[PDB]
Design an enzyme around this catalytic site. Structure first.
Site, PDB file in Angstrom:
ATOM      1  N   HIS A  40      44.559  17.315  36.622  1.00  0.00           N
ATOM      2  CA  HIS A  40      45.234  16.006  36.641  1.00  0.00           C
ATOM      3  C   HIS A  40      44.282  14.783  36.545  1.00  0.00           C
ATOM      4  O   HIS A  40      44.713  13.629  36.435  1.00  0.00           O
ATOM      5  CB  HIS A  40      46.207  15.917  37.810  1.00  0.00           C
ATOM      6  N   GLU A  71      45.082  24.611  36.767  1.00  0.00           N
ATOM      7  CA  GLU A  71      44.751  23.295  37.314  1.00  0.00           C
ATOM      8  C   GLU A  71      43.301  22.922  37.154  1.00  0.00           C
ATOM      9  O   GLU A  71      42.831  21.987  37.766  1.00  0.00           O
ATOM     10  CB  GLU A  71      45.244  23.132  38.758  1.00  0.00           C
ATOM     11  N   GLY A 145      42.204  11.209  47.061  1.00  0.00           N
ATOM     12  CA  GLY A 145      40.770  10.920  47.048  1.00  0.00           C
ATOM     13  C   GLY A 145      39.908  12.142  47.329  1.00  0.00           C
ATOM     14  O   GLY A 145      38.693  12.051  47.370  1.00  0.00           O
ATOM     15  N   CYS A 147      40.521  15.084  45.530  1.00  0.00           N
ATOM     16  CA  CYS A 147      40.631  15.898  44.322  1.00  0.00           C
ATOM     17  C   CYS A 147      39.290  16.071  43.664  1.00  0.00           C
ATOM     18  O   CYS A 147      38.561  15.104  43.428  1.00  0.00           O
ATOM     19  CB  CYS A 147      41.689  15.433  43.338  1.00  0.00           C
TER      20      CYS A 147
END
Ligand SMILES: [Cl-]
Ligand SMILES: [Cl-]
Lengths: 183, 183
Positions: A40, A71, A145, A147
């Site tokens: 993402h 992901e 914050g 990730c």
């Protein structure tokens, strides 16, 4: 403990602060100039790596044999310096662990380290409405914050932090074979 | 490393999340029901300690022999449970250290740990326009929300984090004799 020691050195050698148009993330350098971001973060032809503008030469959102979301995005960077090869530290399969360290390197959370305790093979999960495989879960009073946070134990890089639900965090496991392909 | 190990146990046993009308802080339990906050937390007759309402029976803003600010408030709590006595871990004087850990326990930064490196005897400093003695300094890419952070090395509780300038952090040193008085 020795896990922390391993974590500090890992972050020093191999981690950076990345900003995309999607936000700020931790990036983990893998080998050569190949690095990983959570999917993402959606990095374009250019990222801001450590307040500095680095070209992205190539980017792969990774999927399993069915096209299911892992992901992770694998990026090749336009930069002279080569990451230390940390692939010996990656398992061939989802590793479970009694005691882990999640290591975050943003400007929200600069060179910070959290003990998360038990890391479990959670399996599938809907994440941002996207079905996602190979999630590692831990009891994580979260916040955005983190990730890209690197999840580690002693001698072990386990995965990359890619979300949470307020009460739990999830990491995409960093598997050995994501990182072979060509040269 | 062993410093982290010492830090995790310290925070588990002796630290809490405190909210005042002045903000959210880390509180370090010292002994019995005596605890310390940074002075600018300005706790009233009541605090919110771990989302819970605890009376403050007594409060002392500490000063040196001249009336100079030490930036610490010593509070006695109305609560049955007694802190483990951590005073053996406190020096009689400002301790300098090559390698420290700053440990923060808020909801901004829950159970987080930062290596700060070299801790120096900085001396005096104007902090919020107030002259302040016995500051310990370290290279700290700061942010608000770490006030009360406990600064530690192995076997050592060094001080309480009470400010920064963007680039450096400052801790009020936790000295042995602050913590004798009566019973
Ligand atoms: Cl390796
Ligand atoms: Cl003691």
């Amino acid at each position: 403990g020795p896990a922390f020691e391993f974590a500090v050195a890992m972050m020093k050698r191999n981690s950076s602060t990345v900003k995309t148009e999607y936000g700020e993330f931790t990036m983990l350098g893998i080998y050569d100039r190949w690095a990983v971001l959570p999917r993402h973060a959606k990095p374009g032809p250019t990222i801001l790596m450590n307040d500095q503008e680095v070209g992205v030469l190539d980017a792969k959102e990774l999927v399993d044999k069915d096209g299911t979301n892992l992901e992770l995005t694998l990026l090749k960077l336009n930069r002279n310096e080569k990451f230390r090869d940390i692939r010996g530290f990656l398992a061939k399969e989802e590793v479970e662990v009694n005691e882990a360290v999640l290591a975050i390197n943003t400007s929200k959370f600069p060179n910070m380290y959290i003990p998360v305790g038990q890391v479990t093979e959670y399996g599938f999960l809907n994440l941002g409405g996207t079905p996602t495989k190979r999630m590692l879960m831990y009891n994580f009073p979260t916040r955005a914050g983190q990730c890209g946070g690197v999840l580690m134990s002693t001698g072990k890089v386990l995965g990359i932090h890619v979300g949470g639900n307020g009460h739990q965090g999830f990491s995409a496991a960093l598997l050995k074979h994501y990182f072979n392909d060509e040269q």
